[PDB]
Amino acid sequence: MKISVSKNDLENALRYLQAFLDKKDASSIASHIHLEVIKEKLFLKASDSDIGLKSYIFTQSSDKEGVGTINGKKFLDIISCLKDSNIILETKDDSLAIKQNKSSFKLPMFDADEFPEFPVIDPKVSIEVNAPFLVDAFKKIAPVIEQTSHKRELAGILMQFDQKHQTLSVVGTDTKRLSYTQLEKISIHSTEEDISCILPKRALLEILKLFYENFSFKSDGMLAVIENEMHTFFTKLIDGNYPDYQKILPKEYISSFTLGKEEFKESIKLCSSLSSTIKLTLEKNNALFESLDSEHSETAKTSVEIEKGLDIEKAFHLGVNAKFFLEALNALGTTQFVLRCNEPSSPFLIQESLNAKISTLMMPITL
Amino acid sequence: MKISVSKNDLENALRYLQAFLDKKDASSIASHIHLEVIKEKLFLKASDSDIGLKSYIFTQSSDKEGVGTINGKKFLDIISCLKDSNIILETKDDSLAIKQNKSSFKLPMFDADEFPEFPVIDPKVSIEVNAPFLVDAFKKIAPVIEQTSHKRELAGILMQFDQKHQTLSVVGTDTKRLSYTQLEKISIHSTEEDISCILPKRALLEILKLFYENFSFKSDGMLAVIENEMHTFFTKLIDGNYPDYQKILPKEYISSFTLGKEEFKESIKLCSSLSSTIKLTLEKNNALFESLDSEHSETAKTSVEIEKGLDIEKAFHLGVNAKFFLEALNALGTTQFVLRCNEPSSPFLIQESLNAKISTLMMPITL
Ligand SMILES: NC(=O)c1ccc(F)c(F)c1
Ligand SMILES: NC(=O)c1ccc(F)c(F)c1
């Protein structure tokens, strides 16, 4: 109803909220942010059935407590064009006035009662995340997940909690490749020894913008609520049974090669100028790369020397998807990587030599 | 047929050539760059009926002179993924081989005889441009020209040469606004005392990427050829008669106000958060800005103090298009601008206080 706020505090809060608004129809409440002034806090939220964010900023002054709404895109556009001095926000019946020095604006509010109730859960599982490993895993695994996947449970990331062993397993897949990590020594508070949540990709991406470390993750098996000092975020979970990835992962590998990450990146990028798939050939002191599904009369080839010789009898040949192989290497923190293989026709593994550590299993390309 | 070249020289030449290729159909000669090795130069060109570029780079070594062609997008994609060391280019019948250390590529060449003849003109008009004023004019005027304009001659920029007075006039318009400059003391060599060329917008944009100063501009009234040390560019000219802009420009102005450029930019940007048109009100010591065609219940207002008072009897009101007014101010080099008006319903002028100097005439918005 009446306050002053810091321009930068307000702008930053509004930026984050943009992604939770349906902006195209400005006449719908789904384009508005809900506003609430109580004590010395402005609360801003945007949500619906699926997903939502609640944020707050401190008022520089507060004169009048109450509630309202405002078009979030328009609000952000106005504040962005203002100077750093404090901004006065003030209702005038069903209109919000915005003032700074000689500049003043009016926007219409809607009925705040039309705004969805921001949900709260009775948590069945809860963790406190005090380090970046979880978001690191999220970031490294996200590229393998197809948001528009036509199968529902593969459109999100698996979080598998084992309370008994204090581990959080995180898994993404598109059916051609599967990336995973298991995070150790996580103090999990749960009503069950084993429990699984599937977060939608859309939610995953939002979390990467909002959180880094020092946040809680809580779930009742229907919603996941993530919270820190300034923000409360929620998303609906995805219903199905995520693939048994432990069954999918091979038992052992016939061969394991320790290889140069950046040299393989460069070599693959290079051959991928003319194709999407590549023929890798490994010899004792050499790795050869050749474009595979290139159009005829178009070829790309290169090789790198392997100084510390491989354990090979003549030559191992492997067809690979370039993008997938690169994204697997991109997920690694080490200067070297381990490539574990069985037959050239069976899935192969990429992982770090010896933050989360993300491994990727991958289907090869034939011939 | 056989040479080595510097990677950076080759990459840079290829980047410029990209815009002269139809890249989507890789099976057509229109996706290829023509190649010619003679003396210690590789000549690269891409052209068609409308527009073209010829470039050259120096060979580090030359062994075999001749001609061929290559897909320009693919060539650029390959070279971009290579290291800085020299690159060997070498024909193998109707294929171009590209080699650097352990990396080698083949791409197919097409019949070089299918490539269009690069045109040459007998110039009717010629200038040497030894300073940036021309491209400065081009850059400042380009925003007012609609490339997809449904009327042909307004889809380009007018260049009007007066050999008698040694002036080059440059003019753009979209019918709502007209931006112009007249450049003085240009040594024009022409067969006529007065002559006009209309360059297409597409060509204008290319010229801005390729040229700055120390180039020749030549025309036969059908093509324009622009040339410097490394590059020869051409474009077809547009046929019609460009509007008589000297008739269009007003005789005198009832009032002329000297105003703050950045303050007006900020004020207009600010009000344009909620509208495309703005009501400007000028008073003796004040300028007020208000959103005009904003949706109802949405308002944006601001004002700035004018210390050195205006010559006004009460208040001058003027409806303006925000984007147009901003782009007019963006074209100015001065910290202040002059706004010249007659009736609030008639065209008004924006120009610099007291490089090219671009003035913009503009139709107002009513009420
Ligand atoms: N989920 C699967 O069916 C699958 C099987 C083999 C793979 F290599 C893979 F990446 C995924
Ligand atoms: N070319 C025209 O018809 C024209 C007339 C008045 C203007 F203000 C203008 F910018 C253009």
Q: What is the DSSP string of B76-88?
A: HHHHHTS-SS-EE
Task: Answer yes or no: do A82 and B106 touch at CB < 8 A.
Answer: no
Handedness of CA A234, A235, A241, A246 (dihedral sign): negative
Does any CB of chain B come closer than 8 Å to the CB of residue A107? yes
**What tokens appear for A39 in the block?**
């004590």
Answer yes or no: is the C-beta of A347 below 6 A from any ligand 1 atom: yes
Task: Report the alpha-carbon distance of residue B79 to residue B107 in Å, rounded.
Answer: 12
**What tokens appear for A24 in the block?**
């195209």
Paired residues of B168 in beta bridges: B161, B183
Cβ within 8 Å of residue A206, ≥6 positions away: A19, A20, A51, A53, A233, A235
- Counting from 1 in the atom list of ligand 1, the atom nearest the Cα of A245 is 1
Task: Report the alpha-carbon distance of residue B216 to residue A3 in Å, rounded.
Answer: 63
Structure determination technique employed = X-ray
Handedness of CA B317, B322, B328, B333 (dihedral sign): positive
Task: Answer yes or no: do B81 and A270 touch at CB < 8 A.
Answer: yes
Answer yes or no: is the C-beta of B175 below 6 A from any ligand 2 atom: yes
Residue ranges of chain A assigned to CATH 3.10.150.10? 245-367
Does any CB of chain A come closer than 8 Å to the CB of residue B91? no
List the one residue out of A345, A356, A350 whose CA is nearest residue A326.
Answer: A350
By Cβ distance, the residue of A78, A269, A295 closest to B81 is: A269
Does any CB of chain A come closer than 8 Å to the CB of residue B108? yes
Q: How far is the CA of A319 from the centre of ligand 1 (A)?
A: 16
**DSSP for B320-367, written as a single string:** EEHHHHHHHHHT--SSEEEEEESSTTS-EEEEE------EEEE--B--
By Cβ distance, the residue of A106, A108, A297 closest to B106 is: A297
- Counting from 1 in the atom list of ligand 1, the atom nearest the Cα of A177 is 10
Query: What does DSSP assign to residue B267?
Result: H
Q: Beta A277-283 vs A223-227: how paired, if at all?
A: unpaired
CA distances from B347 to A149, B170, B318, B319, B366 (A): 56, 20, 11, 11, 11
Task: Answer yes or no: do A102 and B303 touch at CB < 8 A.
Answer: yes
Does any CB of chain B come closer than 8 Å to the CB of residue A326? no
Cβ within 8 Å of residue B78, ≥6 positions away: A270, A273, A274, A300, B98, B105, B107
- Counting from 1 in the atom list of ligand 2, the atom nearest the Cα of B177 is 10
Q: How far is the CA of B203 from the centre of ligand 2 (A)?
A: 24
**For an interface test with B, which of A70, A103, A295 has the most B Cβ atoms less than 10 Å from its Cβ?**
A103
Task: Report the alpha-carbon distance of residue B286 to residue B259 in Å, rounded.
Answer: 10
CB B178 within 8 A of CB B144: yes
Does any CB of chain A come closer than 8 Å to the CB of residue B114? no
Task: Report the alpha-carbon distance of residue A358 to residue A334 in Å, rounded.
Answer: 11
Task: Report the alpha-carbon distance of residue A167 to residue A187 in Å, rounded.
Answer: 8
In this structure, what is the dihedral angle of CA atoms B180, B186, B191, B193, given to the nearest 10 degrees? 60
Residue B367, number of CB atoms within 10 A of its CB: 10
Task: Report the alpha-carbon distance of residue B205 to residue B182 in Å, rounded.
Answer: 20
Residues of A in contact with B303 (CB under 8 A): 102
**DSSP for B103-140, written as a single string:** EEEEEE---GGGSPPPP----SEEEEE-STHHHHHHHH
List the one residue out of B337, B362, B319 whose CA is nearest residue B265.
Answer: B337
Compute the C-alpha angle A73/A78/A83, nearest 5°: 140
What is the b/e burial string over A150-189, where b = at least 16 CB atoms within 10 angstroms of the residue's CB?
eeeebbbbbbbbbbeeeebbbbbbbeebbbbbbbeebebe
Does any CB of chain A come closer than 8 Å to the CB of residue B90? no
Answer yes or no: is the C-beta of A158 below 6 A from any ligand 1 atom: no
CB B12 within 8 A of CB B73: no
CB B259 within 8 A of CB B337: yes
Task: Answer yes or no: do A81 and B108 touch at CB < 8 A.
Answer: no
Q: Beta A336-341 vs A286-291: how paired, if at all?
A: unpaired
In this structure, what is the dihedral angle of CA atoms A335, A340, A341, A347, given to the nearest 10 degrees? -90
Amino acid at site B364: P
A-to-B residue pairs, Cβ atoms closer than 8 angstroms: 76
**What tokens appear for A43 in the block?**
């609360």
Amino acid at site A43: F
CA distances from B105 to A196, A274, B75, B98, B99 (A): 49, 9, 10, 5, 6
Handedness of CA B80, B83, B89, B93 (dihedral sign): negative
Q: How far is the CA of A346 from the centre of ligand 1 (A)?
A: 10
Task: Report the alpha-carbon distance of residue A157 to residue A244 in Å, rounded.
Answer: 13
Task: Report the alpha-carbon distance of residue B317 to residue B283 in Å, rounded.
Answer: 9
- Counting from 1 in the atom list of ligand 2, the atom nearest the Cα of B348 is 8
CB B20 within 8 A of CB B51: yes
Does any CB of chain A come closer than 8 Å to the CB of residue B77? yes
Amino acid at site B131: A
Residue A89, number of CB atoms within 10 A of its CB: 22
List the one residue out of A331, A329, A351 whose CA is nearest residue A341.
Answer: A351
Task: Report the alpha-carbon distance of residue A212 to residue A136 in Å, rounded.
Answer: 8
CA distances from A298 to A268, A273, B98, B182 (A): 16, 10, 11, 52
CB hemisphere CA count around B108 (13 angstroms): 12
Resolution limit, Å: 2.1
Residue nearest to atom 4 of ligand 2 (CA): B175
Q: How far is the CA of A256 from the centre of ligand 1 (A)?
A: 19
CA distances from B367 to A147, B292, B315 (A): 50, 9, 14
Answer yes or no: is the C-beta of A120 below 6 A from any ligand 1 atom: no
For domain B245-367, the CATH architecture is Roll (3.10)
Q: Which position has the token pair 């007659």?
A: B342
Instruction: Tell me which of A144, A153, A176, A341 to substitute to probe ligand 1's pocket, judged by most ligand atoms within 8 Å of the beta carbon.
Output: A176
By Cβ distance, the residue of B77, B297, B301 closest to A273 is: B77
CA distances from A222 to A156, A357, B315 (A): 14, 28, 63
Does any CB of chain A come closer than 8 Å to the CB of residue B258? no
Q: How far is the CA of A314 from the centre of ligand 2 (A)?
A: 78
Cβ within 8 Å of residue B60, ≥6 positions away: B3, B4, B5, B6, B86
Compute the C-alpha angle A278/A283/A289, nearest 5°: 20
Does any CB of chain A come closer than 8 Å to the CB of residue B302? yes
Answer yes or no: is the C-beta of B344 below 6 A from any ligand 2 atom: no
